[PDB]
Every structure is written in C-alpha cells, then in structure tokens.
Amino acid sequence: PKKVLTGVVVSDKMQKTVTVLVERQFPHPLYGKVIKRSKKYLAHDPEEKYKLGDVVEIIESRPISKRKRFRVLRLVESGRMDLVEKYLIRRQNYESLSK
Amino acid sequence: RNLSALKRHRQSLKRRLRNKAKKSAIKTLSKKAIQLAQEGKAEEALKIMRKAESLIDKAAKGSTLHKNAAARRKSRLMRKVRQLLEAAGAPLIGGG
Amino acid sequence: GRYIGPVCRLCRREGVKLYLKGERCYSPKCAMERRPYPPGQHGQKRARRPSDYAVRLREKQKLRRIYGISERQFRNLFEEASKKKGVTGSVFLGLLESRLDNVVYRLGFAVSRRQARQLVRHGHITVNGRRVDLPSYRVRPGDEIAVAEKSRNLELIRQNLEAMKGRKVGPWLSLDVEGMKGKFLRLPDREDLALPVNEQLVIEFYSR
Amino acid sequence: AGXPHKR
Amino acid sequence: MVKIRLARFGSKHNPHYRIVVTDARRKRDGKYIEKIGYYDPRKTTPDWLKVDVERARYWLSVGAQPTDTARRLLRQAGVFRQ
RNA sequence: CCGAGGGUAGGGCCCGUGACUGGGGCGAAGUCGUAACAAGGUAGCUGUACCGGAAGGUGCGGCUGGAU
RNA sequence: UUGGAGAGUUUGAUCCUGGCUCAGGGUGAACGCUGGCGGCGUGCCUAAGACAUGCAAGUCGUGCGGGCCGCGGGUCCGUGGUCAGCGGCGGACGGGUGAGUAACGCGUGGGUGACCUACCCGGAAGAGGGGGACAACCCGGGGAAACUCGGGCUAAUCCCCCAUGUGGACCCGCCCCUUGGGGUGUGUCCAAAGGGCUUUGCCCGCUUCCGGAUGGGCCCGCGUCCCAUCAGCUAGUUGGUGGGGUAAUGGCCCACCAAGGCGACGACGGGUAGCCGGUCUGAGAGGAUGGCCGGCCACAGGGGCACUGAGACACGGGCCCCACUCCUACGGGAGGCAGCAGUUAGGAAUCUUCCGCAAUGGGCGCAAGCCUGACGGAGCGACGCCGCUUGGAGGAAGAAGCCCUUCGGGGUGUAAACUCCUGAACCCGGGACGAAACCCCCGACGAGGGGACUGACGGUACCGGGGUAAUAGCGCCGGCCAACUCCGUGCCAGCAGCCGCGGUAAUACGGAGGGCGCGAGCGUUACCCGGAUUCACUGGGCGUAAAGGGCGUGUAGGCGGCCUGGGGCGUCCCAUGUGAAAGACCACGGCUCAACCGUGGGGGAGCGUGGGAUACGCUCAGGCUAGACGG
C-alpha cells in the first residue's frame, strides 16, 4: 500500500506545493524511552487549496518533481498555527547557535 | 590476438548508418509537417504527417525505435499538428 | 599421539592406583603399593597444602590419564556433554566410556586400554560385523563388538578371553566368551561405574 | 606553468 | 529461460545435488527460485532421489526447461506419466 | 552547445620538513638554596597583581581543607 | 528459565576508590624451536603497483556465396571436410577484484494508473508479389610490419517498397474505471524468411498480437560509523509552465516565470568504510567484525564517450585524451592478468607457468558435436580443524650413567636392558562409487519399453595376501599458576605480563638433575570479545576518592494533579503475508569415526495487511481545587 502520512503545513510559499511536517514516535532501541522525530515532505497541492496550519494527509505517489514524491490526499484539521509557531520558533532559535 | 568481436564491430557500423538514416528522415519530415501545420497548409501538412507516421512505425520493425518510442513520437506529432491547424482551417484529408 | 610414556609415575603423582598396566597392577610389583609417593627427587618430602586450582587440575589429570586420551579429545568430549541435555557430569563419563578402545578393554579383550587401543588400532576388532580400527569410535546401544575372524586365533586374545571366563562385566554390557563377541547394551549411569574421580571437580575446572 | 611562475 | 537443473552441494568427492528451478543465467550453486527435490548420485542412502512431481510439473507447464540429466531424474520419478 | 582534460590567475584545508626557539616527560648516587608536610619554625591554600637566581615573596580579597 | 567464578599490584597494617596486569576463547595470520601420515578446509589482509609466455568465448554448412582439398563421374553435380567472408545467436552470463561510494548503495517492508524483458511456455492470426546493396573473388598502388585504399562481379533468414490486417500503434470523440487502467467508433500507420528431410505432410526456423514465467529499471517509509576544535549550506539551487529526452516517473536536460529548498531530530564540511545473510566473543544485553560461501552494489591502467543491441555506456568490444611500456627495417605500429597459472616490486607473509571436460553447469547447434582456466580434480604450504602413528604385555626392593645426600641413603624408574605378542610404513594381487542420459532401437522423433558408448581424479581409494618395533618436540616450575633441588654467577651477566628478581648460600639470572603442562606440535608477536558493573539499557556514579554549572532569568526540549466522555497514535492480543539458500540449533543418516557432508524438524524479532482490547501514556472535549498564580 502507498504509504499515508499525516502532518501540518509549514510552508505555502511555493507554486502548487506545500511543505508537510510529519512527526512519528518510537521507543529508543537501547534506552527504551519513547522519543519524537519529525520530517518535512514536499507535497503536491495542484489546486493550491491548502494553506498554513492545515493538518493534512499525504499519500506516496509517482514523482512530480525531484524531491516531490507525495500528493496531498485530504484535509484533516485547519488553523493549527500553534504547531507552525513551534516549527518557526525552532528554526528561529538557530540564529542563536552560530559563531 | 583476434576475435569475432572484429566482425560484430563491423556489423555495428552497418546498422549504425542504417539507424541514423531512418531517424534523420523521421526528424526531417516531422519538422516539415509541423512547419506546414503552423502555416496550415492544412492538407499538405497531413499528407506529410502520414509519411512521418509511416516511417516511424517502419523503424519500430527493427532495432531503430522501440514500440513505445514510436508511439511517443507519433503521439506528439499529431498532438502538435491539430493545435496548430486549430489556428487555421479545416484538415480536409486524413489522419484524425 | 597418546601419552606413550612411563605409566607408574602417573599413579604415584595422582595419589591413587590407576590400572594402566595389566596384571602387574594386581601384583606386589605394583609401584603404587611399593612407593605410593609422587615421582622425582622431592616425592618423599612433606606435601604442602594444595590450592583449589591444584585440586581440580589433579582430578582432571586423573580422569584423563585413566582413559589415556589427549587433552584435545578430552575437552571436545567435555564440551559436547556441556551442550547436550541433562547433567553434564554423567554424560561426559558416558561418552568417555562409549569410546571403542575403552569398550574393548571393558569387555576384557585386552588387559589395558593402552593394549585395547593397539587391538583396535591394528584392526583386530570389528563393530556390527564391520572392521573398525578407530580407537575413538563412539559405540552406540545395540552395537555388537567382536574379535576379527582373521584374528580370533591369536595367543594374546585367547589368554585374555581365557582369563575373562572368570570375571563378570558391567550391567550396561554383555559378553560371550566362546564366540569372542560382545554387546553394548546401554549408556552407563553414574552409579554404574565407580571411578576414583569426582566429576564435578572436573566440571568446575573448566568453569574457570 | 606558462610562462614563468610565482610559485 | 528459466530452467530445472542440479545445483551440486555436498563436499569434495561426495556429490549431492538439489533438483532446482533457477534462471539459466544464474550461477550453478547460486540463488534458485524453488527447490523441487534432491538427488544423491552415489546411491549412499535408501532414497537417493526425490521429486515433488506436483511442483516439477507446474514449472514444467509454465515453460521451465530441464537439463538432459535432470530430465531423466524427473522421468525416473514419473513426472511424464500420461 | 556541452565536453575529458590542458593552461592562466587567485583562494581554502591537510601532511612532511626548517636555522633557531618554548616548555614537557624520563633518566642509582651532580650544583644552589629549604617553599610544602609539625604552629614545618612567617598557619596553609587561593584568584589576581607586581617583583625576585630558584623554589618563592608581597599586596588586595576569599577559604578552613588552620594549629592552639 | 541449561545461564553469571575470579586473582596480582597503592599501606606498617585496614576499608574504599581507582587505574594497570593476568588466567579464557577467537584468526585468511606471521615469527622462533621442532616436524611422521591422512582427510576436509584454506592461503597477497601490503602496491586497484608493474607485468614476459600460453590459456580463460565461441558456435551454426539444417540461413548464403566462394577459394582450397580430397571422394563418386561429366571441367558438370553431389559429397566430405577446411579456410576466412556475409548472416544468425552468444559474447551484457559465467570468472576477478574492493579502488570508489556514508548513497535509496545496502538491509527491511512496500509503490509502479509511470515501465522493460532475448531464448522458454500457452492461446490467436499469418507468411502473398517485386526490387537492391556489400564482402568473399577478380584488377591496381603502399608497407619491415600492423596492414589499408581504390575500381569492377554476386547470394542469402542480409536491406527496401507494394499487398493482406487476427491484431497492434497514434490523434480526437463518448463508456467504465480512476494518475498514463480496460473499452469502443471514424480517419492514419505497421508484418514476415526462409532452410532440411522420409513429401496433398511433418520437423527446425519467420511474422504481428494477448497472456504467463523469469530477469530487470524506477520510486517511497524505516535502519545504516567518527569529528561540532566542521554551524550554517544552496542558482538547476527549491517549486511552477512549456518542451526535449527515455522502456518509464523526475531539474534527468533546456527556455521562461516564481523565490524558494536544507539545517542542533546535526544541514554543509572533514575522516574512515563496499553493505548484508552471517562470523567471533558474551550469562544475556552488548561489543567487535564482514576473508572463504550466498545475496546486492561498484569498478576493469587513469578518465570521457557513445555505438551495436531484448539487455552494456560493455574486463579479454569500439572512439578520444593522459601516464607508462614495447617492437621497428627508424618510415612507422602495439599493449591493458582486479580471469587461470606465472614474473617482479612491496611486505612479517600468502600456492602449480598441473589434469580434464568424465561429472554438474553454460554458449551454439536438428543432431552428432565444438568451445568452456566456470567447474570437477590433482600439486605446494602443520595456515586451520579432525582422525592416526612413533608400539603392547611382561620385566629387580630396583643395572649402568647422571642428579641429590645428613654419606645411612634418595631420585630418574618398569623407565631401559631383556622376553614374548602385535605389525606404521613398505612388497604383491585384485580394484572401484562418482555414469546414464544426450544418442540409436520399437512404439508415434511423445508417454513407456529395451539397447549401446563414455572417468580427468586413478591402477587412486578400498578389499585381499604378505611385512619391518618403526619421528618427539616445545613451553614452563618466585606469587597470580600446576611444577625444586645442586652448582656457576655476585646490582655482573641477565630475567620480566603485572608485583618484582640479581649487591657471595638466588626454588625468579645461566646450566644440570628432577618436576609440571601440552604433544606434531609448543611457544612468541599483532589484533578482536571476555573478564571490565572500567560508557553501567540490563548494570555505575559526583560532601571529603575523578565528578554540581559562581548565581539568576528564560528559548527549544524532557516531564507533568483529581474526575467523565470521544478517538485509538503509542501499548497489548489474535489471525495473515514476508523473514531465500547456506550457517547456528535438535533428530536421523553417509564417508571405517571424526572434521566434513546429506535429509527432516523447530521457530522468533522487524515490517505489510485484516480484526479486536482501552487500563496506562497521547490527543480532543467537558467539569473540579489538593499544585501554581492572584485579591
């Protein structure tokens, strides 16, 4: 089955493309604790109907471009800009990490 | 110091020229037909376009073109002719 | 190969009478009943308290020199018993007894395993009808160990089979003196054999 | 490596 | 073509083959597609040959080609019995 | 048109080596003094600063892991 | 529940902490001393340095035309070969290597409505008429050669047009589906090749199409080393549109437009490394490793490139550049051992310029057969594992020699001698399994019958008969650690893994006697895991032993009170697919055993799917006041 993921939209700034931020949980193989890990997927939005804060599902599909390998499958939630802020604050904290 | 590789090399050249000549014509008549399709010149375009189509599939008989290559090249040829003639007049003859 | 050297010094070191010769083991010529102290210049000095390692080594050399088997074969057998199911002490003993050259001795065909080996080694033995000249052959239940037909008539085997008309043989074994045959009945239990050897002390030697 | 060089 | 042939296992001077289906371009003792039986040419055991026969006919039906000395061990196992 | 690479020019990283120079470690029985361990004969240690053949000394503040 | 040992060394002594060290197992090993046999394994880890010579890929005369040669005659055919040429198919397999690569490369599970597949199998349809070229050959220059140029003849399953259209391909319609999937209608386009017999028919081939099967390509999830003393990286960069390209998706490629893409969950950079099944160790968790065998990837002197083609950007094919070497008649040309042997260089170190296609397997062929350094075997090497020998029984209160002594004696020691028994090697004789198919025969070139030829290993194994008592070495003996005395030496010469020994009575140096341990081996060096609970998940710590940040504030993050309900993500359960073989494990069996090898059994974890459970953790919703904040 084509893999189906769920994540928010952290970028709408491309033509016919949105960035979907999927996260997953798993126990540490050695230290057992359940840890979080996230990953951005460049998803296909050909109708340009999806926007920031939208929690959506993406489906594995044939390549639209380089790097673009998933299609947005369906909306799930909307207006989750609270998650988008978490992403942006982190990327923002990187300026305080240089030298 | 020898082989029938020498022979298989001689043959590769003969088929190289045989393949190149066919693809040359396929490119020539296709542009020729597309050029008329832009002018349209509707009848003359389609009359050429058939000779293109005929030579294309005639290549997929041997090792010159793969079936899906001929199909792909035919698909884009007729696809381009119609949209050019739609900026002009009736197709008159055939191939559509 | 095998030890092949002076054998009464073995008994004098181990502090116990090992029956490695033959008739001489029962005579008053037995070195053990004559000088029951270790060989060499210091054998008559007063033994100092041995260590725990010494005690376990001494048990192992005891059991091993009984069978005249090299340390390689001795431990490969030990390790086989370690893997197999059950109590490792008994199984290691059973597999030691299952050696053909030990059976040929345990059946009285020869008066010493060292002589039973040469019997097997020169082919004078068969198993289930087939000649078998391998002292290490693991005998299974039901195998019929017999003297070679071409070798039935030989002074050493007769004199040995003669003096065997007297003795009895272990519960796990069987013997027909007139036909020079013999049968391995079962795998010996621990109590079916009383060696002067605490097999646990041989286990503990390798657990180090 | 022209032509003379600097190094 | 897909074939049905003998992939020699065993040891030196101790031949033991597996009648097996594999690609003809695969190496002799290489990754086969399915095992359809074994064969001891030296006849050192009561059953030195064995064929599934049901499977040996499936691959046969779909276009597998036996070897010349594999065709025999399927004949001798009655794969061809009409 | 692209193109192996060759060439010109200028950067970055790494390795080897260099007159000489800096301390470091180690080395049975060298030279100088005696700073520390006892209130070690000026309680010691300390951050800093300055000085002195050398340990060290002194100032400012801190600590007791300071005797009585 | 098959599984867990520890010791030496800091002190006058003690407890603790803590490092160092040792006993174990392991190796593609090497080095020393030593060395008898057999089996199965195994053997350039360094210079992916450089290579002399042979060989490692060819085959088909049942596709075609010839030159030569013998065979039956009329220089006419047929024929057998033989040699190149044309034309098929193969050369993309198999074999080597580990340089590169930290990557969708590999592993594991998936996607392809985005795709391909020669020879094979199954079903459907068809093979009808014309024409043409180029080698071989004939003629002419050039050359030491490699060798090639020119002109002219000719056949074919070689090339091309026309016809036929089951079908298939394309554009545009409508239908079902739903990413380019399956239909249908008009227009348009595409097929072929013949040969051999036994001839109103078979056989090998050809052609378009559908399906299967097998082998692939492409894509995605998760996993995959060290350095943050590498912290910012990016212009085809990230997306879009159009187009090119391909079997096919894609910035893979180009034009243009947009300004995006990535990064502390480690981007970028640097270093190292082929990955896996597995292998080694370990109580396990883990650690270390990836040679041999199997799977995948990558490369073929260093690079770039495409051609031919089902498939290569092709190890023993082609083009070009570079470095190197070579022959030369000095004008000019050749080469690519990381194939099998072999040479040289490097190194501590790593093999025969062996035999054979008999077997398995592969290419070609109607078949006979040909080719096959794949492979099957032989050779060298204690490299490793396993099996075997250098004898067995007897034999004195106990020889000689040498060692110790209290001078009485003690030891080596039943050890030897000696007696008898056996009989490694060697000698003779017989002598294999691996090998029954292809083929021919009858039937029907089938099912099924019956028949014949073939073995490198090898006159080997093994069997039978005879037959000689027939190599033993190496380490160690202060404690750890099993084994002690004498002499020599006198902080010397030397030993040493750690603690330590040697200064004139050394169980610690050197020899000797004796003793311990292993045994065709025994030791040493190197390296891996273990002991090391000393990177501590299992399973550690931080007042004074090494270890709390000088102190706040706070970002990300980690964690989070009582009650009720929704979902079901974590988590738990059941079913189901995958988890190749080998290996490991248990059982049985085959080489006389064993190693080795064959047969069968037992499975997990992880991931795909389907079903279920909802306490806990998570999320959503609603309420509370014990935490917290406020008046």
Ligand code: SF4
């Ligand atoms: S038993 Fe007496 S004689 Fe036989 S060996 Fe032991 S000591 Fe020597």
Ligand SMILES: [Mg+2]
């Ligand atoms: Mg042109």
Ligand SMILES: [Mg+2]
């Ligand atoms: Mg084609």
Ligand SMILES: [Mg+2]
């Ligand atoms: Mg073993």
Ligand SMILES: [Mg+2]
């Ligand atoms: Mg005899």
Ligand SMILES: [Mg+2]
């Ligand atoms: Mg152990």
Ligand SMILES: [Mg+2]
């Ligand atoms: Mg052999």
Ligand SMILES: [Mg+2]
């Ligand atoms: Mg393959």
Ligand SMILES: [Mg+2]
């Ligand atoms: Mg340029």
Ligand SMILES: [Mg+2]
């Ligand atoms: Mg360039």
Ligand SMILES: [Mg+2]
């Ligand atoms: Mg350049």
Ligand SMILES: [Mg+2]
């Ligand atoms: Mg150049």
Ligand SMILES: [Mg+2]
């Ligand atoms: Mg520079």
Ligand SMILES: [Mg+2]
């Ligand atoms: Mg200096």
Ligand SMILES: [Mg+2]
């Ligand atoms: Mg002086």
Ligand SMILES: [Mg+2]
């Ligand atoms: Mg003082």
